[PDB]
Design a binder for this molecule. Structure first.
Ligand code: GTP
Length: 309
Protein backbone atom coordinates (compact mmCIF):
# COMPACT_ATOMS: atom_id res chain seq x y z
CA UNK A 1 0.00 0.00 0.00
CA UNK A 2 1.29 3.41 -1.06
CA UNK A 3 0.27 6.50 0.91
CA UNK A 4 -3.13 8.14 0.55
CA UNK A 5 -4.75 11.23 2.08
CA UNK A 6 -8.48 10.93 2.74
CA UNK A 7 -10.34 14.10 1.73
CA UNK A 8 -13.01 14.76 4.37
CA UNK A 9 -15.71 17.44 4.31
CA UNK A 10 -17.95 18.54 7.18
CA UNK A 11 -21.15 20.32 6.12
CA UNK A 12 -23.34 21.95 8.75
CA UNK A 13 -26.84 22.79 7.56
CA UNK A 14 -29.43 25.00 9.21
CA UNK A 15 -28.76 27.28 12.14
CA UNK A 16 -27.95 24.43 14.51
CA UNK A 17 -25.59 22.81 12.02
CA UNK A 18 -23.71 26.02 11.26
CA UNK A 19 -23.39 27.05 14.91
CA UNK A 20 -21.73 23.69 15.58
CA UNK A 21 -19.37 23.98 12.62
CA UNK A 22 -18.51 27.37 14.12
CA UNK A 23 -17.56 25.58 17.34
CA UNK A 24 -15.39 23.11 15.40
CA UNK A 25 -13.49 26.04 13.87
CA UNK A 26 -12.89 27.76 17.21
CA UNK A 27 -11.57 24.53 18.77
CA UNK A 28 -9.41 23.69 15.76
CA UNK A 29 -10.82 20.63 14.03
CA UNK A 30 -8.51 19.73 11.18
CA UNK A 31 -8.07 17.44 8.22
CA UNK A 32 -11.50 18.65 7.12
CA UNK A 33 -12.91 21.28 4.77
CA UNK A 34 -15.87 23.00 6.42
CA UNK A 35 -19.08 23.93 4.58
CA UNK A 36 -21.93 26.00 6.02
CA UNK A 37 -25.42 25.88 4.49
CA UNK A 38 -28.53 27.83 5.46
CA UNK A 39 -31.56 29.63 4.09
CA UNK A 40 -31.19 32.43 6.64
CA UNK A 41 -28.79 34.71 4.78
CA UNK A 42 -28.04 36.78 7.88
CA UNK A 43 -26.99 33.67 9.81
CA UNK A 44 -24.62 32.52 7.06
CA UNK A 45 -22.57 35.74 6.98
CA UNK A 46 -20.92 35.20 10.38
CA UNK A 47 -20.27 31.52 9.76
CA UNK A 48 -16.48 31.13 9.79
CA UNK A 49 -16.54 28.24 7.33
CA UNK A 50 -14.26 28.14 4.30
CA UNK A 51 -17.35 27.67 2.09
CA UNK A 52 -20.84 29.10 2.54
CA UNK A 53 -23.94 28.62 0.41
CA UNK A 54 -27.53 29.89 0.53
CA UNK A 55 -30.27 27.70 -0.94
CA UNK A 56 -33.37 28.58 -2.94
CA UNK A 57 -33.29 32.37 -2.64
CA UNK A 58 -36.47 32.60 -4.73
CA UNK A 59 -38.14 30.16 -2.32
CA UNK A 60 -37.29 32.19 0.78
CA UNK A 61 -35.87 35.63 -0.13
CA UNK A 62 -33.24 34.60 2.44
CA UNK A 63 -35.42 34.39 5.56
CA UNK A 64 -35.23 30.73 6.59
CA UNK A 65 -37.78 27.97 6.13
CA UNK A 66 -40.29 28.86 8.86
CA UNK A 67 -40.06 25.46 10.56
CA UNK A 68 -41.39 23.82 7.38
CA UNK A 69 -39.17 20.85 6.38
CA UNK A 70 -40.77 20.15 2.99
CA UNK A 71 -39.48 23.47 1.60
CA UNK A 72 -36.14 23.06 3.33
CA UNK A 73 -35.91 19.98 1.12
CA UNK A 74 -36.97 21.75 -2.08
CA UNK A 75 -34.42 24.51 -1.48
CA UNK A 76 -31.66 21.88 -1.44
CA UNK A 77 -32.85 19.86 -4.45
CA UNK A 78 -32.66 23.08 -6.50
CA UNK A 79 -29.12 23.68 -5.29
CA UNK A 80 -28.23 20.06 -6.07
CA UNK A 81 -25.73 21.10 -8.75
CA UNK A 82 -23.95 23.57 -6.47
CA UNK A 83 -23.75 20.97 -3.69
CA UNK A 84 -22.55 18.14 -5.94
CA UNK A 85 -19.53 20.19 -7.06
CA UNK A 86 -18.72 21.49 -3.57
CA UNK A 87 -18.35 17.80 -2.63
CA UNK A 88 -16.73 16.47 -5.82
CA UNK A 89 -14.44 13.55 -5.05
CA UNK A 90 -14.65 13.40 -1.26
CA UNK A 91 -13.91 10.13 0.50
CA UNK A 92 -16.03 11.10 3.51
CA UNK A 93 -18.75 13.71 4.04
CA UNK A 94 -20.27 14.39 7.46
CA UNK A 95 -23.65 16.14 7.62
CA UNK A 96 -24.34 18.06 10.83
CA UNK A 97 -27.67 19.61 11.80
CA UNK A 98 -30.00 20.23 14.68
CA UNK A 99 -33.14 18.32 13.74
CA UNK A 100 -36.61 19.84 14.15
CA UNK A 101 -36.16 23.06 12.17
CA UNK A 102 -37.02 23.66 8.54
CA UNK A 103 -33.83 23.74 6.48
CA UNK A 104 -31.68 21.31 8.45
CA UNK A 105 -34.43 18.72 8.80
CA UNK A 106 -35.43 19.07 5.15
CA UNK A 107 -32.06 19.73 3.55
CA UNK A 108 -29.86 17.19 5.32
CA UNK A 109 -31.27 14.07 3.58
CA UNK A 110 -30.53 15.77 0.25
CA UNK A 111 -26.88 16.60 0.98
CA UNK A 112 -26.33 13.08 2.33
CA UNK A 113 -28.00 11.52 -0.72
CA UNK A 114 -25.66 13.50 -2.98
CA UNK A 115 -22.52 12.45 -1.10
CA UNK A 116 -23.58 8.80 -1.35
CA UNK A 117 -23.96 8.88 -5.13
CA UNK A 118 -20.52 10.52 -5.30
CA UNK A 119 -19.17 7.33 -3.69
CA UNK A 120 -18.26 9.17 -0.49
CA UNK A 121 -18.77 7.57 2.90
CA UNK A 122 -21.56 9.75 4.31
CA UNK A 123 -22.06 9.99 8.08
CA UNK A 124 -24.87 12.01 9.65
CA UNK A 125 -24.35 13.66 13.04
CA UNK A 126 -27.55 15.26 14.35
CA UNK A 127 -29.36 16.12 17.58
CA UNK A 128 -32.83 15.39 18.81
CA UNK A 129 -34.40 18.64 20.07
CA UNK A 130 -34.93 19.29 23.75
CA UNK A 131 -38.35 18.32 25.05
CA UNK A 132 -38.86 21.92 26.19
CA UNK A 133 -38.96 23.05 22.53
CA UNK A 134 -42.43 21.55 22.08
CA UNK A 135 -43.94 18.52 20.40
CA UNK A 136 -44.08 19.95 16.86
CA UNK A 137 -40.30 20.25 16.98
CA UNK A 138 -39.97 16.68 18.26
CA UNK A 139 -42.32 15.34 15.57
CA UNK A 140 -40.56 17.21 12.75
CA UNK A 141 -37.15 16.02 13.97
CA UNK A 142 -38.21 12.37 14.07
CA UNK A 143 -39.38 12.68 10.46
CA UNK A 144 -36.04 14.18 9.40
CA UNK A 145 -34.06 11.43 11.11
CA UNK A 146 -36.12 8.82 9.27
CA UNK A 147 -35.56 10.65 5.99
CA UNK A 148 -31.84 10.98 6.64
CA UNK A 149 -31.00 7.45 7.82
CA UNK A 150 -32.07 6.21 4.37
CA UNK A 151 -29.59 8.64 2.76
CA UNK A 152 -26.64 7.79 5.03
CA UNK A 153 -24.23 4.98 5.75
CA UNK A 154 -24.28 5.78 9.48
CA UNK A 155 -26.56 8.21 11.32
CA UNK A 156 -25.46 9.32 14.79
CA UNK A 157 -28.40 10.72 16.77
CA UNK A 158 -27.69 12.55 20.03
CA UNK A 159 -30.60 13.14 22.47
CA UNK A 160 -30.33 16.71 23.71
CA UNK A 161 -32.59 15.71 26.61
CA UNK A 162 -29.73 13.78 28.24
CA UNK A 163 -27.31 16.71 28.00
CA UNK A 164 -29.34 18.69 30.50
CA UNK A 165 -28.08 16.78 33.50
CA UNK A 166 -24.84 15.25 32.60
CA UNK A 167 -24.43 19.01 32.28
CA UNK A 168 -24.63 21.47 35.17
CA UNK A 169 -27.17 22.03 37.98
CA UNK A 170 -28.50 25.49 37.03
CA UNK A 171 -28.06 25.65 33.27
CA UNK A 172 -29.30 28.49 31.07
CA UNK A 173 -30.86 28.39 27.61
CA UNK A 174 -27.80 29.90 25.92
CA UNK A 175 -25.61 27.41 27.81
CA UNK A 176 -27.77 24.43 26.78
CA UNK A 177 -27.43 25.05 23.05
CA UNK A 178 -23.70 25.64 23.59
CA UNK A 179 -23.43 22.18 25.13
CA UNK A 180 -25.20 20.74 22.09
CA UNK A 181 -22.59 22.51 19.95
CA UNK A 182 -19.73 20.65 21.65
CA UNK A 183 -21.49 17.27 21.51
CA UNK A 184 -21.87 17.50 17.73
CA UNK A 185 -18.19 18.46 17.71
CA UNK A 186 -17.36 15.41 19.84
CA UNK A 187 -19.43 13.39 17.37
CA UNK A 188 -17.51 14.27 14.22
CA UNK A 189 -14.19 14.81 16.01
CA UNK A 190 -14.55 11.31 17.45
CA UNK A 191 -14.61 9.98 13.88
CA UNK A 192 -12.38 12.19 11.74
CA UNK A 193 -9.49 12.53 14.19
CA UNK A 194 -8.88 8.77 13.82
CA UNK A 195 -8.23 9.30 10.10
CA UNK A 196 -6.42 12.63 10.31
CA UNK A 197 -4.50 12.58 13.60
CA UNK A 198 -3.68 8.94 14.43
CA UNK A 199 -1.66 8.18 17.55
CA UNK A 200 0.20 5.04 18.55
CA UNK A 201 -2.56 2.67 17.36
CA UNK A 202 -3.63 4.03 13.98
CA UNK A 203 -6.72 2.82 12.11
CA UNK A 204 -6.67 3.16 8.34
CA UNK A 205 -9.50 4.82 6.44
CA UNK A 206 -10.84 1.52 5.08
CA UNK A 207 -11.39 0.00 8.52
CA UNK A 208 -13.66 2.92 9.43
CA UNK A 209 -15.40 2.61 6.06
CA UNK A 210 -15.97 -1.08 6.76
CA UNK A 211 -17.79 -0.89 10.09
CA UNK A 212 -19.68 2.26 9.06
CA UNK A 213 -20.89 1.23 5.59
CA UNK A 214 -24.58 0.37 5.91
CA UNK A 215 -24.45 0.58 9.71
CA UNK A 216 -27.83 2.29 10.08
CA UNK A 217 -28.46 4.53 13.06
CA UNK A 218 -25.96 4.77 15.90
CA UNK A 219 -25.41 6.43 19.27
CA UNK A 220 -22.38 7.93 21.01
CA UNK A 221 -20.78 8.08 24.43
CA UNK A 222 -18.03 10.35 25.68
CA UNK A 223 -15.92 10.54 28.82
CA UNK A 224 -12.76 12.09 30.16
CA UNK A 225 -10.49 11.79 33.19
CA UNK A 226 -7.07 12.72 34.54
CA UNK A 227 -4.65 11.22 37.03
CA UNK A 228 -3.85 7.55 37.48
CA UNK A 229 -6.51 5.23 36.13
CA UNK A 230 -7.51 8.06 33.79
CA UNK A 231 -7.87 5.86 30.72
CA UNK A 232 -10.43 3.44 32.16
CA UNK A 233 -12.34 6.01 34.22
CA UNK A 234 -12.91 7.90 30.97
CA UNK A 235 -13.77 4.66 29.14
CA UNK A 236 -16.12 3.83 32.02
CA UNK A 237 -17.96 7.16 31.69
CA UNK A 238 -18.17 6.63 27.92
CA UNK A 239 -19.82 3.21 28.26
CA UNK A 240 -22.32 4.59 30.79
CA UNK A 241 -22.95 7.89 29.02
CA UNK A 242 -26.55 9.18 29.14
CA UNK A 243 -26.03 9.96 25.45
CA UNK A 244 -25.60 6.24 24.73
CA UNK A 245 -28.97 5.28 26.30
CA UNK A 246 -27.41 2.19 27.91
CA UNK A 247 -27.46 0.57 24.44
CA UNK A 248 -23.89 -0.71 24.76
CA UNK A 249 -24.33 -4.39 25.65
CA UNK A 250 -26.47 -5.03 22.56
CA UNK A 251 -24.48 -3.18 19.89
CA UNK A 252 -23.10 -5.20 16.98
CA UNK A 253 -20.79 -2.46 15.66
CA UNK A 254 -18.59 -0.21 17.77
CA UNK A 255 -16.01 2.39 16.75
CA UNK A 256 -13.88 3.59 19.67
CA UNK A 257 -11.26 6.34 19.87
CA UNK A 258 -9.06 7.33 22.81
CA UNK A 259 -7.36 10.73 22.66
CA UNK A 260 -4.31 11.80 24.63
CA UNK A 261 -0.95 13.46 24.46
CA UNK A 262 2.08 11.60 23.18
CA UNK A 263 2.49 10.84 26.92
CA UNK A 264 -0.19 8.15 26.41
CA UNK A 265 1.29 4.77 27.30
CA UNK A 266 0.59 1.31 25.91
CA UNK A 267 -0.71 0.19 29.30
CA UNK A 268 -3.42 2.87 29.52
CA UNK A 269 -4.45 2.19 25.92
CA UNK A 270 -4.70 -1.53 26.65
CA UNK A 271 -6.93 -1.39 29.75
CA UNK A 272 -9.43 0.92 28.04
CA UNK A 273 -9.37 -1.22 24.89
CA UNK A 274 -10.06 -4.28 27.05
CA UNK A 275 -12.85 -2.71 29.11
CA UNK A 276 -14.86 -1.90 25.98
CA UNK A 277 -14.41 -5.34 24.41
CA UNK A 278 -15.71 -6.72 27.72
CA UNK A 279 -18.69 -4.34 27.92
CA UNK A 280 -19.60 -5.04 24.28
CA UNK A 281 -21.65 -7.88 22.86
CA UNK A 282 -19.42 -10.95 22.34
CA UNK A 283 -20.40 -11.18 18.65
CA UNK A 284 -19.71 -7.45 18.23
CA UNK A 285 -17.41 -5.93 15.62
CA UNK A 286 -15.11 -3.43 17.35
CA UNK A 287 -12.63 -1.13 15.60
CA UNK A 288 -10.40 0.95 17.80
CA UNK A 289 -7.73 3.62 17.51
CA UNK A 290 -5.60 6.09 19.43
CA UNK A 291 -5.59 9.83 18.73
CA UNK A 292 -2.75 12.26 19.47
CA UNK A 293 -3.49 15.70 20.93
CA UNK A 294 -0.81 17.32 23.09
CA UNK A 295 -3.18 20.18 24.05
CA UNK A 296 -5.46 18.19 26.41
CA UNK A 297 -2.40 17.91 28.65
CA UNK A 298 -3.21 15.39 31.38
CA UNK A 299 -6.76 14.66 30.21
CA UNK A 300 -7.70 11.52 28.30
CA UNK A 301 -10.85 11.47 26.17
CA UNK A 302 -12.70 8.30 25.13
CA UNK A 303 -15.42 8.21 22.48
CA UNK A 304 -17.66 5.25 21.59
CA UNK A 305 -19.89 5.01 18.51
CA UNK A 306 -22.32 2.07 18.79
CA UNK A 307 -24.43 0.95 15.84
CA UNK A 308 -26.99 -1.60 14.81
CA UNK A 309 -29.32 -2.85 17.51
N1 GTP B 1 -26.14 22.56 18.14
C1 GTP B 1 -27.05 23.53 18.12
N2 GTP B 1 -28.38 23.21 17.96
C2 GTP B 1 -29.31 24.19 17.93
C3 GTP B 1 -28.95 25.52 18.06
N3 GTP B 1 -30.08 26.26 18.00
C4 GTP B 1 -31.14 25.43 17.83
N4 GTP B 1 -30.67 24.14 17.79
C5 GTP B 1 -31.47 22.91 17.62
O1 GTP B 1 -31.74 22.75 16.24
C6 GTP B 1 -33.13 22.57 16.02
C7 GTP B 1 -33.56 23.20 14.70
O2 GTP B 1 -32.43 23.80 14.10
P1 GTP B 1 -32.48 25.34 13.62
O3 GTP B 1 -31.15 25.77 13.05
O4 GTP B 1 -32.88 26.22 14.78
O5 GTP B 1 -33.60 25.40 12.47
P2 GTP B 1 -33.14 25.43 10.92
O6 GTP B 1 -32.53 24.12 10.49
O7 GTP B 1 -32.18 26.57 10.70
O8 GTP B 1 -34.49 25.68 10.08
P3 GTP B 1 -35.22 27.12 10.13
O9 GTP B 1 -36.16 27.14 11.31
O10 GTP B 1 -36.00 27.29 8.84
O11 GTP B 1 -34.19 28.22 10.25
C8 GTP B 1 -33.81 23.19 17.23
O12 GTP B 1 -35.04 22.56 17.52
C9 GTP B 1 -32.80 22.99 18.34
O13 GTP B 1 -33.07 21.80 19.05
C10 GTP B 1 -27.61 25.86 18.23
O14 GTP B 1 -27.26 27.04 18.35
N5 GTP B 1 -26.66 24.85 18.25
Amino acid sequence: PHNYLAVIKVVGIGGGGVNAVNRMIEQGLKGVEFIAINTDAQALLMSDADVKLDVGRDSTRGLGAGADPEVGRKAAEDAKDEIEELLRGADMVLVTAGEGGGTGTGGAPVVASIARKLGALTVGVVTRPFSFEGKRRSNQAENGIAALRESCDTLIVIPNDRLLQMGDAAVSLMDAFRSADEVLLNGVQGITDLITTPGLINVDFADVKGIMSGAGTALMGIGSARGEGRSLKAAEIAINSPLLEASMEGAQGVLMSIAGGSDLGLFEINEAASLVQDAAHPDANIIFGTVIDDSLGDEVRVTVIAAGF
